[PDB]
Scaffold this motif. Structure first.
Motif, PDB file in Angstrom:
ATOM      1  N   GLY E  35       0.458  -1.045  -0.139  1.00 52.66           N
ATOM      2  CA  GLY E  35      -0.006   0.188  -0.019  1.00 52.66           C
ATOM      3  C   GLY E  35       0.297   1.173  -0.106  1.00 52.66           C
ATOM      4  N   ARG E  36       2.109   1.308  -0.200  1.00 50.82           N
ATOM      5  CA  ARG E  36       2.965   2.368   0.066  1.00 50.82           C
ATOM      6  C   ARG E  36       3.930   2.076  -1.110  1.00 50.82           C
TER       7      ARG E  36
ATOM      8  N   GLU H  86     -10.585   8.019   4.221  1.00 51.06           N
ATOM      9  CA  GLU H  86      -9.781   8.803   5.470  1.00 51.06           C
ATOM     10  C   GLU H  86      -8.432   9.535   5.067  1.00 51.06           C
ATOM     11  N   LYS H  89      -2.719  11.998   5.488  1.00 57.13           N
ATOM     12  CA  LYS H  89      -1.913  11.391   5.789  1.00 57.13           C
ATOM     13  C   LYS H  89      -0.986  12.808   6.185  1.00 57.13           C
ATOM     14  N   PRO H 105      -6.927   8.843   1.179  1.00 54.61           N
ATOM     15  CA  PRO H 105      -6.597   7.298   0.802  1.00 54.61           C
ATOM     16  C   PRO H 105      -8.403   7.080   0.314  1.00 54.61           C
ATOM     17  N   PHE H 126      -7.960  -1.371  -1.832  1.00 51.96           N
ATOM     18  CA  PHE H 126      -7.603   0.620  -1.323  1.00 51.96           C
ATOM     19  C   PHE H 126      -7.354   0.991  -2.928  1.00 51.96           C
ATOM     20  N   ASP H 129      -4.827   7.013  -3.600  1.00 51.69           N
ATOM     21  CA  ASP H 129      -4.971   8.388  -3.048  1.00 51.69           C
ATOM     22  C   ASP H 129      -5.570   9.388  -4.089  1.00 51.69           C
TER      23      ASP H 129
END
Ligand SMILES: [Zn+2]
Lengths: 97, 49, 57, 192, 171, 77, 144, 1118
Positions: E35-36, H86, H89, H105, H126, H129
């Motif tokens: 996820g990153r 969400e 960040k 996200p 997911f 972004d």
């Protein structure tokens, strides 16, 4: 060399003989430059035996490296010792099957 | 007239000092209006605390 | 932007220099093409080359 | 129709040209420094879209050469020959016949013909009009004290345009010992 | 194999292309699952190679940009019209070198005949071929050691606070 | 004084048109500049100036002054 | 020579003139509500009436300007300007074209000294934009 | 707000409606796209009142539409739903500081259904972004602020048109059906009365053939299309019969290549038109079609139907025949007429939400394609959703939209007005629109339907005239994308206060009154003859019995930038256009000052732009300092606001917020606590009030030039602070890595005096052109040296360090202090790009005073470059000794037709001196006494609304009743002219001269950034001509026209040297330089390199070019 001398500018239809009389050699590989050394690859689109040296007064391998050896065909690589501006004036040719 | 200033914790005009309501550039404009009279040929110094 | 073709140059001229000695070696083709090649005196002469006319051994 | 045909048939009858020049057997290759391969800052490379076309031509030609002497059915050999002709056609004039060849970003590749035609070709952009040295530009104001044969230049522009003359003159008056010191003095903007 | 040999303007060997493909696939899988964006150390420990090798493999795979991409909003300029020819003869530098060459000879002129001659032959200013000490001594007939000493005195003379000023600027 | 002098009419009275005057003055100016450049050498080539000049005067101005004064000739080769 | 809003002098006889023709205009409109005439007749009659009004007001303005007026001095000496602009500033702006090139029967009866209303300003924007676009394309056509 | 600065108003019409939120146009769209709580609150209130009904957010709509994804076998499916977000960040400040993209996200819950055993794998996914929109309607992409501009497009639907046939003088009619994301079909009745049904612009076919293909026999066509002759003529001239035969013929026509089967053509047509996947006219398209043709099919699903085609053919043939009305299907009546393609009933608006939704849809298309391709290969029942969904294409599409797109533009941050006007912009050109060079003259005109929807004054002046515009003040965008406008309902001739939002078509239906019409004060009309707007935009006089709507207020048609020009009705349209376009280039000055005479819009624009800090909850200021304000809220919490001090905007200006409140003052919600770049007390302030006299002065203001005073340089009246940023990075190379170090190889220590221990310049240190800001060294490796340099090294015994210097130096002609330095190290966790080891940024600031060559302007399109700055003692001075600050040329006023500026000057003088009119029983004084403008203390600001300002009678009356000065004398006569003296001669001027106060702006066209010069610099690579631009040294171009001019003069040698030894002659440039330096004759020119390049390029085309000599022998060109 002198613009005063220019009298006429003629155009025509180039034949095969003229096309391979302009050329200084055939290009027979599709390579351009090495991915690590960043130097022209032999027989490629950027070859030095055809299109001339890339360093003033120097050949590919490097045996001859100064002006004193001027206009000499190095036997190791075939590049002639001359200026690097001749890369703006030398053509090649491709022989179609 | 006043021809130069220096503050304790300042390096240039485009900054602010802690605890005051105004920038240094907006304080230079306030001290440009000081009407002072001097009798000394050479430069003289004054202090504000 | 900045860019550089991988080419080197030297501040140097052709006037006032004495050229090193050279020898002319002659080569002949199957179809009758002849040509000359200059090589340094302190050089070895290979047996085979490519033609300057028709690109053949 | 006969007159239009004779306009063309007679051209080859009189001049030194021959019709055989309409079909090629060898293709010339432009010198490398007119299709440069530059290394930008950071290692990025930039090409000129002629390397790609030459590579296509050479790849197709080599594959055809291998196929011919390997021994193959007429179908694939003919397809290879058609590809080779289309590659050469795209090299000379791109998009004239069929759809243009495209690269990254979905834009047509620039061919040999495209470098001569149009308002952005050699003829109209580089040969009839050029960029020049010893030239300046700036905003104009009004001066009513000047005479009809006078103009006023800012001293920065004047010093930039006349750099070589100033260097020569202030080496001549002994204000500087050589050209190097004269150039340094001019660049740093002294008083004399 | 053909796609490995005929897919990039700057060709890469087969094994390096395989390594690039493996690294790209591993990076894609890590990005999807985790996820990153994986850091170089994460890939280095996953691929069992040093981070320097990872960054080198990442660098080798880039595609060259085109000089014909238009950047002018009106559609007149190109990316290749703003690249400076770095290896271009700057007239100022050429004239500076010519002046240096002309000034160097004059400083040698004030020296004695033998000194200037031996210096010129040793450094080949007149011809460009630096000859050996025996070659220099053959002309004058002096010994090798003499050629060694005579040259040293000239360097001491020039490397003095009496003739350096004329030549200090050019260095 | 300056670019304005000498008056153009007076110059044109000594030649045929502007186009010939340009070449005539330019050639004389080149002669004067060539004489000045090689003055350090002891040489017998080129001549002038034939009028009183300043410390550092452009050779073209001197050429125009001599042309106006009538100290030159033009032939056709 | 100087410019002040008291130098821009509107004719004193303009008002009455307009009022006169205004009444006439009203009559024609009534004849349309009674069904005795068609649309084209009404439009043409209104255009003619208001062209006459514009010309008469222009004559009055021309006769009203003194010789020593700063603006009349600028126009008379040939320094800058002409008579159409000085008619628009102090007089009647006249008849204006539509989005399609065709005259609108209802005119602009207020000069820039008195100030236009909202609808009049909106009506003038049409011709303004058309002129700007014409200039923009002329720039390239002439060069070709 | 009640806490607004005092500003007396001359308005005489009371408005019943406040201007809406100026930024709603983008915030509402993005809230709809996301599905925020704000959108839910809006739609909740929408129920039972108004129409904001759309109950599905954009993302929800896309996820619902895309699902389900099913296999061909149909044994298994995958579905998405229930999207969620969400918290981000990083904050906005961190994103702008470290060059990150502000986003959040996105999660979507997907189920994984199997027809066998009833499997379900509900799990979270997911999706990436998703970028977010800040509170000011701007995106933070890669650390830079960007704005997405709405797009004007032609709405989908059915459009009929008619033209004249040139040859036969016969009318030709056509009818197109254009959807979104689909193919076109267009019918046309040509000159011969034959009806073609052109399909996908593929040649031409008879419509009867299409009808036969769809399954219509000859008898149905004959009985239906009986009364008309075109259909009968087409039917007889067919020579074909049979559904299958016609279908095969259609296949042969459209897609030749094979002998087709009747089944291939049917599925081909179904996929082309009737298949929703490949053809979908949206809700707007179905709504428009239903309105036009009278069909009442539901709006839920959009796809072409045979009924629609038949109705279109009937409509077209009826239009051609000459029938003006019809009875549409499932309806009562319909009007048969042609359509205008520029009416705002046919032009709609794609805002930010719709554009981003289109991009997301394009991404999800490839996502589902990959998913379905992957579904088959992998074994069934051994998979989970995380192994199917690949999110790379979605993020790729989003990042491709937000970078390298025409609609996502670099934000324009000269001042609050420019930023606000960058939003509220409608652009008619871009991806999917019409290009710049193709627009005719009909799409660049002011349609009569623009009234209240698009400003007719504010548009660009270049080649974009008409293709870009600004939304009006009250404009509101419908749910379908059409713009609305409010109108007050009038019934029984009484103007009630009920307000209705009306679009273009409904507006055409009614008759609308005028905003500034006489009212009896009983809410009834008095003149008994009101000027009104009718169907075709025609203005006409009507009695107060037929009017059924009225404008809410004047200045309803003008934009926000154009509503800030006082005395607009007195200006020409062109000058007002230039003034509005030029008010957006003003720079913020160090000391702001609100206009003395203005409109009522300054406060609203300043606060709604978002550049003015505002309190959130009422409280008392607890602590205060130039860096922050801490307020103790009443509810029991403390909140601290941080102020920007000397930041940098996109354009290089300075963003600097001052404080307004005091340490004890009480603040209510919405009150202003800190100003902005160019606001003064919470209201816009772009310039300064200067005393101006109109007169020609010694020719120094000849032809638009301007003469200033020295007092404006002494007191920093027009001074501004400008900031610039320089970047440099150290990376890896072949011969090891580059280093940022203070040990530059060969330079005196004096140069390395201000550098820090890290080799970076020190804060607070002044710089000038040539100084080094960052010391960098790059290794070069061993190289061969020329004999002369080797001998020099031997003499001096120096050693080549093997590293050269590549430090960062300030450009040529630059100066200023050093504000800050920011350094990123790749080894310190910083996210530097690949291959970059270190990066550093340096900020240089400087304060610029006004100097000649700088450009000033006013609000009425009167610009000019300062060409003189006189001392204070030789400016004309009034009778009491006050010099004038600026001198303007009268000649520019009358010819340009903008008398507004003179009125502004007179009213500015009146406001500056203050007046007192309370006892006067005069007609004009009565009006003032009814609006509270009786007594005005000197210096008080005044307001004149756009089309409801101050009449000249009031000004003329007030000029006699100002406050006398200390000597008891009024210096300005009742004619508005004052008696001035001469600064130099001292004698009084013969006649009085106009004087007053004008609001003067400073434009961002400073001469410092315009000047450049060159003698030698960089050269290009392929052709060896000088490089172009100003970042380099750059050479000026010598185009075709200059060559023609020199040829006309007869100058041959000058032209030859310009074209050869200055651009192309490579070996001649150095020789010319050497000849100049050594003082000798310039050499003869050579042959340009461009000609040689041309010859090589032609020879590469197998053209045998050759240059001959006096005899026929080639020269070989070296
Ligand atoms: Zn070699």
């Amino acid at each position: 060399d002198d613009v005063n001398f220019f009298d006429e500018l003629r155009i025509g239809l180039a034949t095969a003989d003229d096309i391979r009389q302009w050329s200084h050699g055939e290009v027979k590989k599709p390579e351009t430059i090495n991915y690590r050394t960043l130097k022209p690859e032999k027989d490629g689109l950027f070859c030095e035996k055809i299109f001339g040296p890339t360093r003033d007064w120097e050949c590919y391998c490097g045996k001859y490296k100064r002006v004193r050896f001027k206009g000499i065909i190095c036997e190791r690589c075939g590049v002639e010792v001359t200026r690097a501006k001749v890369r703006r004036e030398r053509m090649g040719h491709i022989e179609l099957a | 007239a006043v021809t130069s200033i220096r503050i304790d914790g300042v390096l240039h005009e485009f900054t602010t000092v802690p605890g005051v309501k105004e920038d240094v550039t907006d304080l230079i404009l306030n001290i440009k209006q000081l009407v002072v009279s001097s009798e000394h040929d050479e430069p003289v110094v004054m202090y504000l605390r | 932007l900045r860019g550089t073709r991988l080419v080197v140059t030297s501040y140097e001229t052709d006037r006032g220099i004495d050229l090193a000695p050279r020898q002319a070696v002659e080569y002949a083709c199957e179809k009758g093409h002849r040509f000359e090649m200059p090589f340094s005196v302190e050089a070895e002469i290979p047996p085979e080359w490519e033609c300057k006319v028709c690109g053949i051994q | 129709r006969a007159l239009k045909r004779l306009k063309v048939v007679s051209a080859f009858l009189q001049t030194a040209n021959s019709p055989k020049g309409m079909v090629l057997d060898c293709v010339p290759v432009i010198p490398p420094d007119l299709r440069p391969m530059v290394q930008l800052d950071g290692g990025r490379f930039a090409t000129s879209d002629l390397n790609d076309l030459y590579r296509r031509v050479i790849n197709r030609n080599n594959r055809l050469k291998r196929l011919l002497d390997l021994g193959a059915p007429e179908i694939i050999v003919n397809n290879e020959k058609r590809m080779l002709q289309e590659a050469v056609d795209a090299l000379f004039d791109n998009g004239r016949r069929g759809r243009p060849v495209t690269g990254p970003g979905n834009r047509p590749l620039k061919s040999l013909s495209d470098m001569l035609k149009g308002k952005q070709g050699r003829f109209r952009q580089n040969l009839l009009g050029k960029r020049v040295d010893y030239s300046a530009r700036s905003v104009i104001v009004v001066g009513p004290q000047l005479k009809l044969h006078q103009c006023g230049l800012p001293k920065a522009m004047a010093l930039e345009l006349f750099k070589p003359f100033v260097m020569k003159r202030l080496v001549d008056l002994n204000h500087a010992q050589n050209i190097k010191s004269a150039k340094r003095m001019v660049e740093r903007g002294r008083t004399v | 194999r053909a796609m490995a040999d005929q897919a990039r303007t700057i060709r890469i060997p087969v094994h390096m292309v395989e390594v690039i493909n493996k690294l790209a696939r591993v990076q894609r899988q890590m990005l999807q699952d985790l996820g990153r964006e994986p850091t170089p150390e994460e890939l280095a420990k996953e691929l069992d190679m040093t981070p320097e090798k990872v960054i080198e493999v990442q660098k080798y795979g880039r595609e060259p940009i085109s000089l014909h991409t238009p950047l002018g909003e009106d559609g007149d300029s190109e990316f290749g019209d703003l690249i400076e020819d770095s290896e271009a003869v700057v007239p100022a530098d050429a004239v500076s070198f010519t002046l240096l060459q002309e000034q160097l000879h004059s400083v040698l002129d004030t020296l004695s005949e033998r000194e200037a001659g031996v210096v010129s032959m040793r450094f080949g200013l007149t011809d460009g071929q630096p000859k050996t000490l025996d070659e220099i001594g053959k002309v004058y007939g002096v010994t090798r050691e003499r050629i060694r000493q005579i040259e040293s005195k000239t360097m001491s003379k020039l490397r003095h606070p009496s003739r350096s000023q004329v030549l200090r600027d050019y260095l | 004084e300056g670019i304005i002098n000498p008056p153009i009419d007076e110059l044109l009275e000594a030649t045929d048109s502007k186009y010939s005057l340009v070449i005539y003055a330019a050639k004389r100016a080149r002669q004067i500049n060539a004489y000045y450049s090689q003055l350090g050498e002891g040489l017998l080539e080129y001549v002038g100036p034939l009028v009183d000049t300043h410390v550092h005067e452009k050779p073209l101005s001197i050429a125009l002054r001599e042309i106006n004064a009538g100290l030159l000739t033009s032939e056709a080769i | 020579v100087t410019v002040a809003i008291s130098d821009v002098v509107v004719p004193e006889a303009k008002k009455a003139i307009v009022k006169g023709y205004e009444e006439q205009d009203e009559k024609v409109q009534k004849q349309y509500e009674r069904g005795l005439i068609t649309k084209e007749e009404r439009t043409q009659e209104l255009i003619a009436i208001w062209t006459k009004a514009t010309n008469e007001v222009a004559e009055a303005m021309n006769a009203n300007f003194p010789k020593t007026n700063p603006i009349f001095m600028m126009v008379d000496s040939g320094a800058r300007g002409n008579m159409m602009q000085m008619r628009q500033i102090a007089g009647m702006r006249g008849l204006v074209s539509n989005a399609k090139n065709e005259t609108i029967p209802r005119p602009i009866k207020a000069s820039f000294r008195e100030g236009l209303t909202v609808l009049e300003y909106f009506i003038s924007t049409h011709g303004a934009r058309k002129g700007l676009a014409d200039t923009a394309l002329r720039t390239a056509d002439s060069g070709y | 707000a009640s806490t607004a600065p005092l500003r007396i108003s001359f308005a005489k019409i009371k408005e019943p409606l406040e201007v809406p939120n100026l930024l709603a146009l983008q915030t509402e769209s993005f809230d709809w796209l996301l599905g925020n709580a704000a959108w839910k609150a809006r739609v909740e209130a929408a129920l039972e009142s108004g129409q904001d009904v759309p109950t599905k957010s954009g993302l929800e709509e896309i996820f619902e539409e895309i699902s389900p994804i099913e296999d061909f076998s149909g044994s298994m499916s995958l579905t998405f739903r229930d999207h969620r977000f969400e918290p981000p960040k990083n904050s906005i400040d961190e994103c702008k500081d470290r060059d990150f993209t502000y986003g959040a996200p996105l999660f979507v819950t997907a189920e994984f259904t199997n027809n066998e055993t009833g499997e379900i794998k509900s799990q979270t996914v997911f999706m990436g972004d998703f970028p977010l929109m800040t509170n000011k309607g701007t995106f933070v992409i890669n650390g830079t602020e960007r704005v997405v501009v709405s797009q004007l497009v032609r709405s989908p639907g059915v459009y009929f048109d008619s033209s004249i046939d040139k040859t036969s003088d016969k009318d030709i009619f056509s009818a197109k059906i254009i959807p979104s994301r689909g193919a076109w079909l267009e019918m046309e009745i040509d000159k011969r009365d034959l009806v073609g049904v052109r399909i996908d612009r593929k040649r031409k076919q008879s419509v009867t053939v299409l009808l036969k293909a769809l399954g219509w026999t000859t008898e149905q066509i004959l009985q239906e299309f009986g009364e008309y002759e075109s259909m009968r003529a087409t039917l007889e001239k067919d020579h074909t019969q049979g559904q299958d035969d016609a279908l095969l013929d259609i296949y042969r026509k459209l897609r030749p290549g094979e002998p087709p089967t009747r089944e291939a053509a049917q599925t081909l047509l179904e996929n082309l038109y009737f298949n929703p996947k490949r053809y979908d006219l949206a809700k707007v398209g179905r709504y428009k079609v239903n309105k036009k043709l009278g069909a009442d099919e539901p709006l839920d699903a959009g796809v072409l139907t045979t009924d629609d085609v038949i109705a279109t053919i009937k409509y077209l043939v009826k239009l051609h025949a000459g029938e003006t009305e019809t009875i549409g299907e499932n309806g009562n009546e319909i009007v048969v007429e042609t359509d205008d393609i520029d009416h705002f009933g046919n032009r709609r608006l794609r805002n930010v939400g719709e554009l981003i939704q289109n991009q997301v849809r394009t991404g999800l298309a490839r996502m589902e394609r990959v998913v379905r391709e992957r579904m088959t290969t992998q074994d069934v029942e051994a998979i989970t959703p995380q192994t199917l969904i690949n999110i790379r294409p979605v993020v790729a599409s989003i990042k491709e939209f937000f970078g390298t797109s025409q609609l996502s533009q670099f934000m324009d941050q000269n001042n609050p007005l420019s930023g606000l006007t960058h939003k509220r912009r409608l652009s008619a050109l871009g991806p999917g629109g019409l290009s710049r060079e193709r627009a005719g003259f009909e799409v660049r005109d002011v349609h009569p339907s623009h009234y209240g929807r698009m400003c007719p004054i504010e548009t660009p002046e270049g080649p974009n005239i008409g293709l870009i515009g600004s939304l009006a003040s009250y404009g509101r965008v419908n749910a379908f994308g059409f713009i609305e406008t409010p109108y007050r309902k009038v019934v029984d001739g009484q103007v009630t206060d009920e307000v209705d939002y009306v679009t273009a078509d409904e507006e055409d239906r009614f008759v609308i009154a005028q905003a500034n019409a006489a009212l009896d004060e009983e809410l009834r009309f008095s003149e008994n003859r009101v000027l009104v707007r009718k169907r075709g935009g025609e203005v006409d006089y009507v009695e107060p019995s037929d009017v059924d709507y009225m404008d809410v207020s004047p200045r309803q048609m003008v934009s926000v930038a154009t509503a800030m020009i006082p005395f607009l009705e007195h200006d020409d349209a062109n000058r007002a256009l230039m003034g509005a376009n030029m008010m957006r280039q003003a720079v913020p000055l160090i000391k702001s000052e609100a206009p003395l005479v203005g409109t009522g819009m300054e406060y609203r624009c300043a606060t709604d732009a978002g550049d003015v800090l505002k309190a959130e909850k009422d409280g008392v200021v607890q602590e205060l300092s130039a860096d922050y304000i801490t307020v103790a809220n009443d509810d029991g919490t403390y909140i601290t606001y941080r102020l920007h001090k000397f930041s940098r905007s996109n354009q290089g200006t300075s963003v600097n917020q001052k404080v307004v409140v005091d340490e004890g003052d009480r603040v209510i919600e919405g009150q202003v606590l800190a100003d902005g770049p160019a606001t003064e007390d919470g209201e816009m302030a772009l310039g300064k009030n200067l005393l101006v006299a109109f007169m020609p002065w010694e020719g120094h203001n000849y032809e638009d030039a301007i003469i200033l005073s020295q007092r404006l340089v002494q007191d920093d009246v027009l001074s501004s602070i400008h900031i610039e940023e320089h970047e440099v990075d150290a990376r890896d190379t072949k011969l090891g890595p580059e280093e940022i170090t203070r040990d530059i190889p060969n330079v005196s220590e004096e140069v390395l005096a201000d550098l820090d221990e890290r080799g970076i310049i020190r804060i607070g240190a002044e710089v000038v052109a040539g100084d080094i800001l960052v010391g960098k060294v790059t290794p070069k490796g061993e190289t061969e040296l020329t004999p002369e340099e080797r001998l020099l090294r031997a003499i001096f015994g120096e050693k080549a360090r093997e590293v050269r210097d590549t430090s960062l130096k300030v450009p040529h002609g630059e100066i200023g202090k050093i504000i800050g330095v920011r350094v990123f190290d790749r080894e310190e966790g910083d996210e530097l790009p690949p291959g970059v080891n270190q990066l550093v940024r340096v900020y240089v600031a400087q304060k610029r005073k006004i100097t000649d060559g700088d450009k000033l302007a006013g609000r009425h399109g009167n610009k000019g470059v300062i060409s003189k700055i006189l001392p204070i003692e030789d400016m004309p001075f009034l009778e009491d000794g006050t010099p004038v600050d600026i001198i303007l040329n009268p000649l520019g006023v009358p010819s340009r037709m903008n008398p507004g500026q003179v009125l502004e000057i007179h009213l500015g003088w009146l406001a500056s001196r203050g007046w007192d009119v309370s006892g006067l029983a005069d007609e004009w004084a009565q009006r003032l006494q009814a609006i509270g403008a009786d007594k005005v203390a000197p210096g008080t600001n005044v307001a004149t609304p756009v089309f409801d300002g101050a009449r000249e009678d009031e000004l003329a009356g007030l000029l006699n009743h100002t406050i006398p000065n200390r000597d008891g004398e009024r210096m300005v006569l009742p004619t508005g002219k004052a008696r001035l003296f001469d600064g130099r001669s001292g004698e009084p001027f013969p006649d009085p001269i106009s004087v007053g106060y004008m609001y003067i702006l400073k434009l961002h066209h400073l001469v410092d950034d315009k000047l450049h010069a060159r003698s030698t610099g960089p050269y290009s690579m392929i052709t060896q001509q000088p490089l172009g631009g100003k970042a380099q040294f750059g050479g000026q171009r010598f185009g075709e026209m200059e060559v023609w001019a020199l040829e006309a003069y007869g100058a041959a040698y000058a032209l030859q040297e310009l074209l050869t030894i200055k651009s192309d002659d490579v070996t001649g440039r150095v020789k010319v330089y050497e000849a100049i330096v050594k003082g000798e004759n310039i050499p003869e020119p050579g042959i340009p390199e461009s000609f040689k390049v041309l010859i090589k390029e032609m020879q590469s085309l197998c053209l045998n070019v050759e240059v001959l000599s006096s005899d026929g022998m080639s020269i070989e060109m070296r």
